[PDB]
Design a protein around this ligand. Structure first.
Ligand SMILES: [Mg+2]
Ligand SMILES: [Mg+2]
Ligand SMILES: [Mg+2]
Ligand SMILES: [Mg+2]
Ligand SMILES: [Mg+2]
Ligand SMILES: [Mg+2]
Ligand SMILES: [Mg+2]
Ligand SMILES: [Mg+2]
Ligand SMILES: [Mg+2]
Ligand SMILES: [Mg+2]
Ligand SMILES: [Mg+2]
Ligand SMILES: [Mg+2]
Ligand SMILES: [Mg+2]
Ligand SMILES: [Mg+2]
Ligand SMILES: [Mg+2]
Ligand SMILES: [Mg+2]
Ligand SMILES: [Mg+2]
Ligand SMILES: [Mg+2]
Ligand SMILES: [Mg+2]
Ligand SMILES: [Mg+2]
Ligand SMILES: [Mg+2]
Ligand SMILES: [Mg+2]
Ligand SMILES: [Mg+2]
Ligand SMILES: [Mg+2]
Ligand SMILES: [Mg+2]
Ligand SMILES: [Mg+2]
Ligand SMILES: [Mg+2]
Ligand SMILES: [Mg+2]
Ligand SMILES: [Mg+2]
Ligand SMILES: [Mg+2]
Ligand SMILES: [Mg+2]
Ligand SMILES: [Mg+2]
Ligand SMILES: [Mg+2]
Ligand SMILES: [Mg+2]
Ligand SMILES: [Mg+2]
Ligand SMILES: [Mg+2]
Ligand SMILES: [Mg+2]
Ligand SMILES: [Mg+2]
Ligand SMILES: [Mg+2]
Ligand SMILES: [Mg+2]
Ligand SMILES: [Mg+2]
Ligand SMILES: [Mg+2]
Ligand SMILES: [Mg+2]
Ligand SMILES: [Mg+2]
Ligand SMILES: [Mg+2]
Ligand SMILES: [Mg+2]
Ligand SMILES: [Mg+2]
Ligand SMILES: [Mg+2]
Ligand SMILES: [Mg+2]
Ligand SMILES: [Mg+2]
Ligand SMILES: [Mg+2]
Ligand SMILES: [Mg+2]
Ligand SMILES: [Mg+2]
Ligand SMILES: [Mg+2]
Ligand SMILES: [Mg+2]
Ligand SMILES: [Mg+2]
Ligand SMILES: [Mg+2]
Ligand SMILES: [Mg+2]
Ligand SMILES: [Mg+2]
Ligand SMILES: [Mg+2]
Ligand SMILES: [Mg+2]
Ligand SMILES: [Mg+2]
Ligand SMILES: [Mg+2]
Ligand SMILES: [Mg+2]
Ligand SMILES: [Mg+2]
Ligand SMILES: [Mg+2]
Ligand SMILES: [Mg+2]
Ligand SMILES: [Mg+2]
Ligand SMILES: [Mg+2]
Ligand SMILES: [Mg+2]
Ligand SMILES: [Mg+2]
Ligand SMILES: [Mg+2]
Ligand SMILES: [Mg+2]
Ligand SMILES: [Mg+2]
Ligand SMILES: [Mg+2]
Ligand SMILES: [Mg+2]
Ligand SMILES: [Mg+2]
Ligand SMILES: [Mg+2]
Ligand SMILES: [Mg+2]
Ligand SMILES: [Mg+2]
Ligand SMILES: [Mg+2]
Ligand SMILES: [Mg+2]
Ligand SMILES: [Mg+2]
Ligand SMILES: [Mg+2]
Ligand SMILES: [Mg+2]
Ligand SMILES: [Mg+2]
Ligand SMILES: [Mg+2]
Ligand SMILES: [Mg+2]
Ligand SMILES: [Mg+2]
Ligand SMILES: [Mg+2]
Ligand SMILES: [Mg+2]
Ligand SMILES: [Mg+2]
Ligand SMILES: [Mg+2]
Ligand SMILES: [Mg+2]
Ligand SMILES: [Mg+2]
Ligand SMILES: [Mg+2]
Ligand SMILES: [Mg+2]
Ligand SMILES: [Mg+2]
Ligand SMILES: [Mg+2]
Ligand SMILES: [Mg+2]
Ligand SMILES: [Mg+2]
Ligand SMILES: [Mg+2]
Ligand SMILES: [Mg+2]
Ligand SMILES: [Mg+2]
Ligand SMILES: [Mg+2]
Ligand SMILES: [Mg+2]
Ligand SMILES: [Mg+2]
Ligand SMILES: [Mg+2]
Ligand SMILES: [Mg+2]
Ligand SMILES: [Mg+2]
Ligand SMILES: [Mg+2]
Ligand SMILES: [Mg+2]
Ligand SMILES: [Mg+2]
Ligand SMILES: [Mg+2]
Ligand SMILES: [Mg+2]
Ligand SMILES: [Mg+2]
Ligand SMILES: [Mg+2]
Ligand SMILES: [Mg+2]
Ligand SMILES: [Mg+2]
Ligand SMILES: [Mg+2]
Ligand SMILES: [Mg+2]
Ligand SMILES: [Mg+2]
Ligand SMILES: [Mg+2]
Ligand SMILES: [Mg+2]
Ligand SMILES: [Mg+2]
Ligand SMILES: [Mg+2]
Ligand SMILES: [Mg+2]
Ligand SMILES: [Mg+2]
Ligand SMILES: [Mg+2]
Ligand SMILES: [Mg+2]
Ligand SMILES: [Mg+2]
Ligand SMILES: [Mg+2]
Ligand SMILES: [Mg+2]
Ligand SMILES: [Mg+2]
Ligand SMILES: [Mg+2]
Ligand SMILES: [Mg+2]
Ligand SMILES: [Mg+2]
Ligand SMILES: [Mg+2]
Ligand SMILES: [Mg+2]
Ligand SMILES: [Mg+2]
Ligand SMILES: [Mg+2]
Ligand SMILES: [Mg+2]
Ligand SMILES: [Mg+2]
Ligand SMILES: [Mg+2]
Ligand SMILES: [Mg+2]
Ligand SMILES: [Mg+2]
Ligand SMILES: [Mg+2]
Ligand SMILES: [Mg+2]
Ligand SMILES: [Mg+2]
Ligand SMILES: [Mg+2]
Ligand SMILES: [Mg+2]
Ligand SMILES: [Mg+2]
Ligand SMILES: [Mg+2]
Ligand SMILES: [Mg+2]
Ligand SMILES: [Mg+2]
Ligand SMILES: [Mg+2]
Ligand SMILES: [Mg+2]
Ligand SMILES: [Mg+2]
Ligand SMILES: [Mg+2]
Ligand SMILES: [Mg+2]
Ligand SMILES: [Mg+2]
Ligand SMILES: [Mg+2]
Ligand SMILES: [Mg+2]
Ligand SMILES: [Mg+2]
Ligand SMILES: [Mg+2]
Ligand SMILES: [Mg+2]
Ligand SMILES: [Mg+2]
Ligand SMILES: [Mg+2]
Ligand SMILES: [Mg+2]
Ligand SMILES: [Mg+2]
Ligand SMILES: [Mg+2]
Ligand SMILES: [Mg+2]
Ligand SMILES: [Mg+2]
Ligand SMILES: [Mg+2]
Ligand SMILES: [Mg+2]
Ligand SMILES: [Mg+2]
Ligand SMILES: [Mg+2]
Ligand SMILES: [Mg+2]
Ligand SMILES: [Mg+2]
Ligand SMILES: [Mg+2]
Ligand SMILES: [Mg+2]
Ligand SMILES: [Mg+2]
Ligand SMILES: [Mg+2]
Ligand SMILES: [Mg+2]
Ligand SMILES: [Mg+2]
Ligand SMILES: [Mg+2]
Ligand SMILES: [Mg+2]
Ligand SMILES: [Mg+2]
Ligand SMILES: [Mg+2]
Ligand SMILES: [Mg+2]
Ligand SMILES: [Mg+2]
Ligand SMILES: [Mg+2]
Ligand SMILES: [Mg+2]
Ligand SMILES: [Mg+2]
Ligand SMILES: [Mg+2]
Ligand SMILES: [Mg+2]
Ligand SMILES: [Mg+2]
Ligand SMILES: [Mg+2]
Ligand SMILES: [Mg+2]
Ligand SMILES: [Mg+2]
Ligand SMILES: [Mg+2]
Ligand SMILES: [Mg+2]
Ligand SMILES: [Mg+2]
Ligand SMILES: [Mg+2]
Ligand SMILES: [Mg+2]
Ligand SMILES: [Mg+2]
Ligand SMILES: [Mg+2]
Ligand SMILES: [Mg+2]
Ligand SMILES: [Mg+2]
Ligand SMILES: [Mg+2]
Ligand SMILES: [Mg+2]
Ligand SMILES: [Mg+2]
Ligand SMILES: [Mg+2]
Ligand SMILES: [Mg+2]
Ligand SMILES: [Mg+2]
Ligand SMILES: [Mg+2]
Ligand SMILES: [Mg+2]
Ligand SMILES: [Mg+2]
Ligand SMILES: [Mg+2]
Ligand SMILES: [Mg+2]
Ligand SMILES: [Mg+2]
Ligand SMILES: [Mg+2]
Ligand SMILES: [Zn+2]
Lengths: 107, 149, 14, 49, 64
RNA sequence: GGGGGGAACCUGGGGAACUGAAACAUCUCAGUACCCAGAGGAGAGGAAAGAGAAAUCGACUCCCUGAGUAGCGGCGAGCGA
RNA sequence: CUGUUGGGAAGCAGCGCCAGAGAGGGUGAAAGCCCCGUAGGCGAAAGGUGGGGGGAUAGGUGAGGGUACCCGAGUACCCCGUGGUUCGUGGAGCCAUGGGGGAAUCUGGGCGGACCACCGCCUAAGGCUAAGUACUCCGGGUGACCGAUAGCGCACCAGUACCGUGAGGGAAAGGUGAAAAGAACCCCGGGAGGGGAGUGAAAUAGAGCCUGAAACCGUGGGCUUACAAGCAGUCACGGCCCCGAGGGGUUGUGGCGUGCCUAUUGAAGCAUGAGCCGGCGACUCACGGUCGUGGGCGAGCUUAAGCCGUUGAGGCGGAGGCGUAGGGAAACCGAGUCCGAACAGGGCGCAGCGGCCGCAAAGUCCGCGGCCGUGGACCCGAAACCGGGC
RNA sequence: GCUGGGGCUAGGAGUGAAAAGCUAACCGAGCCCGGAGAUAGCUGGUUCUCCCCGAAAUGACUUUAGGGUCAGCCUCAGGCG
RNA sequence: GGAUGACCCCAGGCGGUAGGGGAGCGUUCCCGAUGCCGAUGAAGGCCGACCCGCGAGGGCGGCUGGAGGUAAGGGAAGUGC
RNA sequence: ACCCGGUGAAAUUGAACUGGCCGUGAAGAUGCGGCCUACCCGUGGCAGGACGAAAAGACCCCGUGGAGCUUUACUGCAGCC
């Protein structure tokens, strides 16, 4: 039906494990099918590019590698801590993700 | 007493005999079967309880005897089972067939007959038959037989 | 292989 | 027999929960020490009479 | 499946209380005119099968 | 309204042989394998012209038991309420 | 949450916290608290179901007294030929029915094992009827189930490739790494392939990719061999090379020496099988029996199907079975019985250890083991027979 | 007479100027799938180690003779001594 | 002998096919296990002239390997070529 | 056919370090004994041996195996009376 992404494009997340543990950055892109996310400036890898149009002189380019979506915790826009997401039901009937440490919404 | 301590007594769980698993076993190769007979084959011999190699067997050369019965089968008649006095020694007051089924002495569906082996006791004994001996012992001891029918 | 060529007959040791 | 007490105790790695109608020897031997209701000791005493 | 009783055995043989196998003497179904009295008399009796044959037949009577 | 299909299961119409009987024909294998018709989510059966000895029971189906008993049988191998 | 090793922490250390949730799977290694979950709850406009709860409808229902009107016809019934039943012609009933004959309407008819009488049971020749039962194409749960020669034929684009006119037959083939970061660019080369550079913790992890055994092929080195007779080794001593009063490798001379398996009276045998290596490959299971054995209980022992509970908890259930008495074809009698006229003879039968309590035991239930019967029953192999199709 | 195209006849059956010839590269009874893991008293094969004992190739009977039943001979357990 | 494998002493037996019997090794799996061994390196591989065992085997060490393995005591079998 | 360049099979194969004679041996020995002979490895040729290869001997016997055929063998069935 859907792959459970606790994290969405655009919100600020903390990388909690691996060579980049501690880093903080915005979710640039969520790849559900692979259960992974790209975090800005995290998981930098060198990639060989053939000499061609768009890459004359060729060589290598810096690219941001995908991170297992489990290695990522959203930073709460209110209390500023990393946190698990809860589900709060508005009176409207809608449902938003809400931080657990404090109580703020993360949209 | 913990699980690591739970243990069958010596000799309660014997190991099995495995044939056809090598020369050291003493049971390998021919698998304790000898060489090359009907009996060595899979399927083996005919019923070694009856078959005698083709000749007339020692059971089938014996004569039959008595009525074997015929269709439509058994004839329903009253069946009697005996109970000796020495069996009744455990009861007091009265004895009936219905009471002796529960002791496990008289089968169900059989009629009660008391027999003479033992010592009679001053008891009320209700039963479908009595021995010549059981009657004499029972009277001479103060008991009361009650031939029902 | 699927097909067996027939073997030669024997010499008639009769 | 108390459902609430077996609820409270179930999740602990060191506690095997059991109703009295359920007392078997394997569970008794699996465990180091035994703890019973007076109500449950009544059932154990009944089933060995 | 459970064993069946051998019915030839049940019609020729009885298992005594201690487990001896008892049968009728053979030899006086017919041809009896020129036989002795000692002969028919004695052949009217039962006899106790030899041990090795008795134990074969007892295996044929599994529910006696 | 029918027609055709559906893995097994079900009922009906037909229906082998190897094999076993240490040969073989009655017997066995077996009303099995299989062919055909029909049916359905089940089918079959079913409300006594019953059982069978109890002066009893109370439709049918299915399980346990009765029982390898009663019996059947070149009274053989076996078959079997 | 933090620190620490590390490419990576979930490992280790320190201080905490949840639990009706410590089933399980993931995440860079080994995580209750990171992720997906789990316990516990919640949920349908629409379609399907609805055996439960409710309502409706169809439908249903008395006595005597008279009367003798009806009560299932090519039917019952008898006979001939068969089938079904445990019943194979048997004393052969019953149920069925192809052929002939052929009724009656309750004072009628059928049955209780030929037949007759008596006492009984039941009302044929129209139909329908849920539930408890079977099965598994299909969905889900769970394994003292498999783990790529296994498990389905198929983990993979398999009922395919391929074979066959056709019915039909019928494979092989999984795995880089945490992440493609899947090697820009340079060098030799037509390419293929390689050498550098670069990535990675690791590149004999480089895609002909995890581990990477063996047969088999090669390169390098140590010892050795061109006057020598050999199931190839073994024992001895000596030489050389290696490792540090010893050991390893090699083998020059001397001694001894008829492969393995199978089958056989007897094989090195010139009798069988095997090129060599890897993997697959043959005494089991169920029910019954018979001994033995470890226990439980013991003139007693034991439950089956089921029912309740559990959700890897157990209990109920005594129907029934084995045993407590044997003898006889049986009637029958019974510690006796059978043959017999017999009080005759004979056959088959009958009777714990201590100090009222204890040990033990008839027996029986369960476990285990050997062996037996029934099944394909230790595994592989016919030539054939039969059925339905092509 | 030979030959193309279109057709009919088949498994205990066809067809045969007759050879038991031919019926899809082996026909004294086609092929496939199934019964089926037919049956095989025959041949072959039967996988780790150590310790104790240790046979027989005879008799009787057998549509039996290279297979069996009983006995003889081996082994284990318990008893007697 | 000491006191019922606690080790010692003396004496004797110990060729072996069919076959009987005894005691053990190892493989897969279950309980032991919410445990314990494990990246300071699991299983598997390759060596070893070392240690234990009569033997089947088990250790230990080095290399390889890179994520599993599993004790004492028992339980069950698709268990050794 | 032979030599050089290119491509490159096969049945078979326990392993082999695979000689003669006279003996021996399961009765026809490269493999055992005693002698005799014999430096190491090939190439083109011949076919005496390797009881050479191939085909689980068709003959023959054995199996209470099979199939075709026959008849005044047995017992049935069709058909016909
Ligand atoms: Mg959601
Ligand atoms: Mg909404
Ligand atoms: Mg066992
Ligand atoms: Mg053993
Ligand atoms: Mg074993
Ligand atoms: Mg062995
Ligand atoms: Mg042996
Ligand atoms: Mg054998
Ligand atoms: Mg045997
Ligand atoms: Mg043999
Ligand atoms: Mg032999
Ligand atoms: Mg023999
Ligand atoms: Mg053999
Ligand atoms: Mg022989
Ligand atoms: Mg034999
Ligand atoms: Mg024998
Ligand atoms: Mg067979
Ligand atoms: Mg056989
Ligand atoms: Mg005979
Ligand atoms: Mg007679
Ligand atoms: Mg009888
Ligand atoms: Mg050939
Ligand atoms: Mg729990
Ligand atoms: Mg717990
Ligand atoms: Mg625990
Ligand atoms: Mg008979
Ligand atoms: Mg008798
Ligand atoms: Mg007579
Ligand atoms: Mg005379
Ligand atoms: Mg006289
Ligand atoms: Mg006379
Ligand atoms: Mg007389
Ligand atoms: Mg019985
Ligand atoms: Mg239809
Ligand atoms: Mg039918
Ligand atoms: Mg049918
Ligand atoms: Mg037919
Ligand atoms: Mg036939
Ligand atoms: Mg027949
Ligand atoms: Mg036949
Ligand atoms: Mg069969
Ligand atoms: Mg036969
Ligand atoms: Mg036969
Ligand atoms: Mg025959
Ligand atoms: Mg039949
Ligand atoms: Mg249909
Ligand atoms: Mg249903
Ligand atoms: Mg129904
Ligand atoms: Mg009906
Ligand atoms: Mg009616
Ligand atoms: Mg029969
Ligand atoms: Mg039948
Ligand atoms: Mg670091
Ligand atoms: Mg950390
Ligand atoms: Mg800690
Ligand atoms: Mg867990
Ligand atoms: Mg749980
Ligand atoms: Mg851990
Ligand atoms: Mg783990
Ligand atoms: Mg976890
Ligand atoms: Mg986990
Ligand atoms: Mg729930
Ligand atoms: Mg839930
Ligand atoms: Mg009238
Ligand atoms: Mg009739
Ligand atoms: Mg009949
Ligand atoms: Mg009949
Ligand atoms: Mg008949
Ligand atoms: Mg009769
Ligand atoms: Mg009849
Ligand atoms: Mg009639
Ligand atoms: Mg009739
Ligand atoms: Mg009729
Ligand atoms: Mg009347
Ligand atoms: Mg009448
Ligand atoms: Mg009638
Ligand atoms: Mg009746
Ligand atoms: Mg009548
Ligand atoms: Mg009736
Ligand atoms: Mg009527
Ligand atoms: Mg009616
Ligand atoms: Mg119906
Ligand atoms: Mg029903
Ligand atoms: Mg469906
Ligand atoms: Mg399923
Ligand atoms: Mg499934
Ligand atoms: Mg696994
Ligand atoms: Mg594979
Ligand atoms: Mg496969
Ligand atoms: Mg593999
Ligand atoms: Mg395998
Ligand atoms: Mg496998
Ligand atoms: Mg495959
Ligand atoms: Mg599939
Ligand atoms: Mg393909
Ligand atoms: Mg083709
Ligand atoms: Mg084609
Ligand atoms: Mg197929
Ligand atoms: Mg991978
Ligand atoms: Mg991958
Ligand atoms: Mg990694
Ligand atoms: Mg160039
Ligand atoms: Mg290149
Ligand atoms: Mg290069
Ligand atoms: Mg390169
Ligand atoms: Mg490292
Ligand atoms: Mg490597
Ligand atoms: Mg690697
Ligand atoms: Mg890997
Ligand atoms: Mg590799
Ligand atoms: Mg390689
Ligand atoms: Mg070299
Ligand atoms: Mg010289
Ligand atoms: Mg020299
Ligand atoms: Mg030599
Ligand atoms: Mg010397
Ligand atoms: Mg040296
Ligand atoms: Mg030396
Ligand atoms: Mg030498
Ligand atoms: Mg060998
Ligand atoms: Mg031979
Ligand atoms: Mg020979
Ligand atoms: Mg030789
Ligand atoms: Mg040779
Ligand atoms: Mg040879
Ligand atoms: Mg031979
Ligand atoms: Mg061989
Ligand atoms: Mg070959
Ligand atoms: Mg080789
Ligand atoms: Mg091999
Ligand atoms: Mg066995
Ligand atoms: Mg047993
Ligand atoms: Mg037992
Ligand atoms: Mg008990
Ligand atoms: Mg006791
Ligand atoms: Mg009980
Ligand atoms: Mg007497
Ligand atoms: Mg008399
Ligand atoms: Mg006496
Ligand atoms: Mg006992
Ligand atoms: Mg036995
Ligand atoms: Mg079978
Ligand atoms: Mg079998
Ligand atoms: Mg067996
Ligand atoms: Mg076969
Ligand atoms: Mg025939
Ligand atoms: Mg035929
Ligand atoms: Mg046919
Ligand atoms: Mg046909
Ligand atoms: Mg023309
Ligand atoms: Mg033409
Ligand atoms: Mg044409
Ligand atoms: Mg024609
Ligand atoms: Mg035709
Ligand atoms: Mg036609
Ligand atoms: Mg046709
Ligand atoms: Mg034919
Ligand atoms: Mg035919
Ligand atoms: Mg014809
Ligand atoms: Mg012509
Ligand atoms: Mg064809
Ligand atoms: Mg042809
Ligand atoms: Mg043909
Ligand atoms: Mg078929
Ligand atoms: Mg069959
Ligand atoms: Mg079979
Ligand atoms: Mg046969
Ligand atoms: Mg000896
Ligand atoms: Mg002899
Ligand atoms: Mg003969
Ligand atoms: Mg002879
Ligand atoms: Mg024979
Ligand atoms: Mg014997
Ligand atoms: Mg003796
Ligand atoms: Mg003996
Ligand atoms: Mg000694
Ligand atoms: Mg020995
Ligand atoms: Mg073991
Ligand atoms: Mg566990
Ligand atoms: Mg640790
Ligand atoms: Mg590391
Ligand atoms: Mg290492
Ligand atoms: Mg292991
Ligand atoms: Mg493993
Ligand atoms: Mg080792
Ligand atoms: Mg290792
Ligand atoms: Mg793991
Ligand atoms: Mg384990
Ligand atoms: Mg263990
Ligand atoms: Mg245990
Ligand atoms: Mg196996
Ligand atoms: Mg030249
Ligand atoms: Mg050339
Ligand atoms: Mg080429
Ligand atoms: Mg080749
Ligand atoms: Mg050599
Ligand atoms: Mg030479
Ligand atoms: Mg000679
Ligand atoms: Mg000579
Ligand atoms: Mg010679
Ligand atoms: Mg020579
Ligand atoms: Mg030699
Ligand atoms: Mg010699
Ligand atoms: Mg020589
Ligand atoms: Mg010589
Ligand atoms: Mg010479
Ligand atoms: Mg040459
Ligand atoms: Mg030559
Ligand atoms: Mg030659
Ligand atoms: Mg020649
Ligand atoms: Mg040859
Ligand atoms: Mg053959
Ligand atoms: Mg031959
Ligand atoms: Mg031949
Ligand atoms: Mg001959
Ligand atoms: Mg012949
Ligand atoms: Mg004959
Ligand atoms: Mg014969
Ligand atoms: Mg014949
Ligand atoms: Mg034929
Ligand atoms: Mg024939
Ligand atoms: Mg006609
Ligand atoms: Zn917050």
């Amino acid at each position: 039906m859907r792959v459970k992404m606790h994290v969405k494009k655009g919100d600020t997340v903390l990388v909690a494990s691996g060579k980049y543990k501690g880093r903080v950055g915005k979710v640039k892109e969520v790849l559900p099918k692979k259960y992974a996310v790209i975090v800005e400036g995290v998981n930098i890898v060198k990639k060989a590019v053939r000499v061609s149009p768009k890459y004359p002189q060729g060589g290598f380019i810096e690219k941001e590698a995908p991170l297992h979506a489990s290695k990522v915790r959203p930073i709460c826009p209110a209390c500023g801590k990393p946190t698990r997401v809860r589900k709060k039901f508005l009176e409207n009937g809608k449902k938003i993700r809400v931080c657990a440490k404090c109580g703020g919404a993360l949209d | 007493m913990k699980l690591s301590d739970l243990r069958p007594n010596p000799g309660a769980n014997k190991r099995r005999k495995r044939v056809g698993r090598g020369p050291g076993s003493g049971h390998g190769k021919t698998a304790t079967r000898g060489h090359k007979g009907q009996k060595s084959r899979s399927g083996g011999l005919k019923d070694p309880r009856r078959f005698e190699g083709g000749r007339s067997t020692t059971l089938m050369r014996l004569p039959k005897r008595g009525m074997q019965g015929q269709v439509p089968g058994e004839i329903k008649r009253p069946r009697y089972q005996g109970v000796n006095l020495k069996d009744l020694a455990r009861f007091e007051g009265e004895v009936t067939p219905e009471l002796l089924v529960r002791a496990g002495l008289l089968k169900k569906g059989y009629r009660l007959k008391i027999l003479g082996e033992g010592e009679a006791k001053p008891l009320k004994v209700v039963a479908h038959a009595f021995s010549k001996s059981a009657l004499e012992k029972l009277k001479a001891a103060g008991g009361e037989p009650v031939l029902l029918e | 292989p699927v097909y067996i060529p027939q073997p030669r007959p024997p010499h008639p040791r009769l | 027999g108390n459902e609430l007490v077996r609820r409270a105790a179930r999740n602990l790695p060191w506690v095997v929960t059991l109703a009295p109608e359920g007392l078997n020897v394997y569970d008794i031997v699996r465990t180091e020490r035994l703890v019973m209701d007076l109500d449950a000791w009544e059932v154990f005493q009944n089933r060995i009479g | 499946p459970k064993m069946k009783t051998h019915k030839g055995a049940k019609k020729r043989v009885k298992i005594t209380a201690s487990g001896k196998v008892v049968a009728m003497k053979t030899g006086k179904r017919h041809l009896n005119w020129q036989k002795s009295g000692k002969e028919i008399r004695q052949k009217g009796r039962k006899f106790v099968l030899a041990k090795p044959e008795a134990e074969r037949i007892k295996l044929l009577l599994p529910y006696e």
